[PDB]
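Re: your question from the hallway

Yes, I did run it. Sequences:
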Amino acid sequence: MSYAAYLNVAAQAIRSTELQTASVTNRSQTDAFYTQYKNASEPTPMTK
Amino acid sequence: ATLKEVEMRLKSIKNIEKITKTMKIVASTRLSKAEKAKISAKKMDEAEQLFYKNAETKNKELIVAITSDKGLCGSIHSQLAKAVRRHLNDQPNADIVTIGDKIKMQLLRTHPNNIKLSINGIGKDAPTFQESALIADKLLSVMKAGTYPKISIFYNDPVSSLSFEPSEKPIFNAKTIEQSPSFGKFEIDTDANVPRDLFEYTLANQMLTAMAQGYAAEISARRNAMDNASKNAGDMINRYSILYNRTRQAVITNELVDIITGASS
Amino acid sequence: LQFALPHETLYSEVTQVNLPAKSGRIGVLANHVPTVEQLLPGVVEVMEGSNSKKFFISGGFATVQPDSQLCVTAIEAPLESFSENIKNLLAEAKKNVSSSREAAEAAIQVEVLENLQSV
Amino acid sequence: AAVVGQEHYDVASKVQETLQTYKSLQDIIAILGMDELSEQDKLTVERARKIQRFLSQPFAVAEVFTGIPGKLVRLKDTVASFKAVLEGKYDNIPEHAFYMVGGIEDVVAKAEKLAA
Amino acid sequence: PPSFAEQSTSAEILETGIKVVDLLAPYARGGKIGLFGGAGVGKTVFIQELINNIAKAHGGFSVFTGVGERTREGNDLYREMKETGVINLEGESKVALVFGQMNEPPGARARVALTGLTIAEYFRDEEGQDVLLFIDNIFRFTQAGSEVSALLGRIPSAVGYQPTLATDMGLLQERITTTKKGSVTSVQAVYVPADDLTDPAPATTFAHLDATTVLSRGISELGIYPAVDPLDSKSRLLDAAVVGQEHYDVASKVQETLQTYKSLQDIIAILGMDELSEQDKLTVERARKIQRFLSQPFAVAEVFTGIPGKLVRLKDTVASFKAVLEGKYDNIPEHAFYMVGGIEDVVAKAEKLAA
Amino acid sequence: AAVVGQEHYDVASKVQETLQTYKSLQDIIAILGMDELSEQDKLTVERARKIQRFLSQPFAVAEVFTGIPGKLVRLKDTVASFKAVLEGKYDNIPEHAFYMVGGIEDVVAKAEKLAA
Amino acid sequence: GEWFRDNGKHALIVYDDLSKQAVAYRQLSLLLRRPPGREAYPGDVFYLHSRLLERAAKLSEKEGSGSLTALPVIETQGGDVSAYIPTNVISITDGQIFLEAELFYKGIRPAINVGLSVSRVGSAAQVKALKQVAGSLKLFLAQYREVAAFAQSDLDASTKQTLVRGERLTQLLKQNQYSPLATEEQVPLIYAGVNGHLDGIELSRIGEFESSFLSYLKSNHNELLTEIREKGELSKELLASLKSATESFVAT
Amino acid sequence: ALKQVAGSLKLFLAQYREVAAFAQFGSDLDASTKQTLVRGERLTQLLKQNQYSPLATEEQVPLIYAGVNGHLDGIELSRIGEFESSFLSYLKSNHNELLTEIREKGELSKELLASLKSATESFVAT
Amino acid sequence: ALKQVAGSLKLFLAQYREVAAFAQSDLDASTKQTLVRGERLTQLLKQNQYSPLATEEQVPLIYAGVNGHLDGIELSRIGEFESSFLSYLKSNHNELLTEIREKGELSKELLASLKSATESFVAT
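Structure:
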């Protein structure tokens, strides 16, 4: 995506029926979620 | 200490020892899967960080905390959160991003207005670069990563199988890279934001390595813990088995007497 | 020893290394200047006297050492004994997505794909 | 309360609730151990385990079994001592200090001895 | 029972010829051996083997007593015995059969044990031999003695057993023993009520056993024959001072070897044998050879299998397993040690398996 | 089946399997929460709880206890409503809507009445 | 029964039930004021049932080779096999068929606990053909009982497979009442089962599978069925015959 | 009167033990379970009573009503002790006219529920 | 003699059993240190059958036990040393055995007199 990730879109456009046996198909699925935190209380939820 | 009780009591332990022994065997295989991702990540840590070895880059602080959302694994989250507060003494006002809820829950209770971002849905499978790049990206995004004087990732390092270790490791932002003491030795050709990226991408990489090691340290713990659960419920079963036979036996005698006395009259 | 992917690590003594650096191809070896360079999405090769073995790669970082050790890092990676129709059908969907932030990621695919075609 | 008075009465009850809670958890701690308890629960246990050890007392007559010369605490002495512990005024003391000693003074003593 | 005078002053091993037995759970001479396990474990084959081996190696007869017999099994045994020729209608038998089946009334079932025992006690005193007396099943003897007590209107003891329970066993067991003339050794099938080793019955019985021999479903399923469990079958005559040092040390280390293996069974089925140190994986690859060398082809099973059976003299069992423990047969593959005589039968069989 | 028909017998058997499963899983629910479950399981449990409640019913006789009017249900209405429940054609309705009511009419009625 | 036994014929006898017989014997004894033991049964309560069941046998050729088989019924209480009577009888019989309401409410009827059911006679009494395609069956269902609790997300393909056979196999042994199967009708189903021709099929369709398989086999392969029913064994050819006919039906 | 405000209490207190058993899983609670947990805990606490101190019906009634209709639900558990007597003290002092109607009539008419409703809210705000 | 040299030895081992049965957690060099004792100590009680020791022979072993003179000796060389040590004392520090056999008591006189015979054999 970004640069940090630049090479994770260049590696995930370049990801997309071979090597993807577990390894990469799963390297492609990330289940993270972020949430900002304010004055204890949070902000809101969203997928990473 | 009736018979009715002791029976079902003894059952639910057998049923527990089953689950705990399953747990152990299930983690062992999961540690095989996460062993290979801890050699391939700690190797990408080699090529990356080696550049730093030369620049000897020496470090609004950004602490990133790493664990998972999963409980049932001993003091993984508990004692990592402590080293994070040990280091969170010397800078009471340092921003935290947390990966995995159990750590977030831990710190949310003690430094409740330190944390600005949090990640979840992690320690289920072995972590991949894909995540490590997307979190780094988001650390760059909302967290304003490069614009931080200092960044350190906190993770559980796996010392053996039986024991792990709360650990820290430094991320070195751009600037520092430019002022690298031994950076002059490298004939690296200033064409637009070049140290920024290296930072933005050492934040992702370092984080991964940490996550890989933390997870593979946790799996080891889960295995070892669950193993011992099986040993204990094992020994308990033995005790209750003995108590069971006693009760049974007496149940027979007290029941019998009732009749004998009934019979003499 | 020193050439790693995040899932599979590869090489260990080397007599010639060819890399696709940030600015054009370069060749490290025996004694070389300590350097760090972004690695572009392109082919690579190792040497052991007169041994030819070329890989493709996603991109990453190379870093020649003062102690002389070369460290090369990438993500994904045998040459033609790895990657035609698998590339073709994908190239179709690739160019298609470009016409669509989302289509920007497809721009990255066009350059990475076009490169692979030459192999 | 009509006999021992509201404070001695309440220092008692509160001690018992504590011990009774520790007891209620005996099963979870047996299987899951301490790490699965909440925060309030966690404290109660460490406190109860202290109260429990503090309830032990060296007896002069039983000297040939402890080794430690026996102690006699007083009623006013005991109530205060326990009240302080139930206000957590000693939480920072190793559980062992509470074991087999006289009144609250003996705890701070043994804890200084061991902290050396 | 033979007075305190006529007593054996020293305990002594009876040789049986079975590797598992002699090496791990060696039998008392004039002792009592608790035999454990139901069907599917070749119990009767194993029994016949001992009858044969006690007759062949030593030179003493055997008496098989059926206490509380299932008649079906009486008909099977009797035929199977003829079929195995331990009974020889035309020539000579090695065993006398005294049956007392379930259908018979409580008095009958109590005495049959004595009925048989008497016969066996003749071969020890008149002919001065080392006789085998089999009792199947010593538990149902107990059972019967209880019914007799109830009918006689005596007050039941604890758990409804006969008040006489101890002495009743004594009278029986105390005639089974070594004299200066000879010895009667007994193998007694032992059932365990509700799986409770604390139940009066087994409790009071174990009080006389000197060795248990436990056959196992797990052991037969692994193809090992006899299906003796090497770990469970324990002899209270396996002490260094009484089997000698070399025997003992060997057996000790053998169990120890098999112990470490048993516990490693689970980490192997998860992370592979890639999860073992130098020392650990060494014994494991070796323990297999030991667990395979424990299996032994029987002479009595020759009609069933056709494979020539081997009687292993106890010194072989010692030196054979000795040479293996040090690592003198590591280059030798595993299918050599399986189903053979001594160590020299591994040597000759591995030369078949080689070229 | 010979007496009540196959459909009746099948519903009745399935209802039973459901609750039997739900009973068997109450170990894993206690120990590892509701979290640690297969998705089919999670639904089976969801459906089992709904079913447990739909088995209760206000008796007329017992008005002194529930203050709730006695509801009587026709045998065909029973089987039809349980059939529906079983195929998931009611997975959205909250647990309480099945509790102490008559036929599936009353499940819908209550569902809305509470959501109101 | 013995009439038939003694006369070269064969009978089978069902005792429904022995529990209640023992109860009866008890009533007589207590009233006669014969001395009571465990649970107030007389000493010879064992001797009662032993006498009874020992009468069952396979007589030798000289005796007309007749036979009497015994199905005594015994009623446990809350599953108590240690209960006095069940103890006696279990130790008399040549094995048990074991039922459990748990299995019953699961819908597994007959509700036979396999792990608990044994026949000491066993092998020797089985249509050689059925014993041919089922030496694996006790094997598979044994390992399926041991990996059962794994039915609750991340299982490796080996213990995944084991759960695949087990469910289908267990399903294959459900059997509505009053509808017993001819041997030549069992061996096909147990074949398709054991040799993995059901792993493809979903678990609910295993119902209609049996019905349609057997009726198809009747029309299009009545000849193999006939050989099984007559020869009682399976040729190397017959194994390829069945195999082929199955793979044809499974594809279809 | 007691009947009217005790509607369903006994069943609810059962549901409470229900949710409190499920609480032992220590898995996160939602706004529905936490809701009934908070109330069951306070209701439990509201029924505790010292020996030798039987209460008049009109003392019982407003207590129960305060608990049931959830006016106690935002108050610390250790303080529910002081709530009870502090409440009754105030009701005697001020709205004695209600307390004496409850007693005399034994039945909360629709307006008496009103006065009581008001009276409770009033006091809870402190 | 023994009571002097075995100060509290009882509840030491008796509360050592509940500790080591809470290990199968983390590296805690507080109770980890006290573990190296309780193992060498139980290894020290190990007695082969028909082996009656005299009092004077037990006292020096408990000495090195509760004084921890043997921690640097291998776990599988604990009972082996038991034979080596008595060989060392029987023809050197002979009077130490003789006086504990005469009195049965211990002065501070015999304390340091044996605290030289112990670390001596730890080196040799």
